[PDB]
Amino acid sequence: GLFPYGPD
């Protein structure tokens, strides 16, 4: 994903 940058 975009937020958070950690997970997708």
Please check whether residue 1 is in contact with residue 8, taking contact to mean a CB–CB distance below 8 angstroms: yes
**Residue with tokens 């940058």, as numbered in its chain:** 5
Interatomic CA distance for residues 3 and 7, integer angstroms: 8
> Tokens at residue 1, please?
């994903």
Interatomic CA distance for residues 8 and 2, integer angstroms: 7
Interatomic CA distance for residues 1 and 4, integer angstroms: 7
Q: How many CA atoms lie within 13 A of 2 on its CB side?
A: 0
Annotate 1-8 with b (16+ C-beta within 10 A) or e (fewer): eeeeeeee
What residues contact 1, with CB distance under 8 A and at least 6 apart?
7, 8
Please check whether residue 8 is in contact with residue 2, taking contact to mean a CB–CB distance below 8 angstroms: no
Structural biology method used: NMR
Interatomic CA distance for residues 8 and 6, integer angstroms: 7
> Tokens at residue 2, please?
């975009």
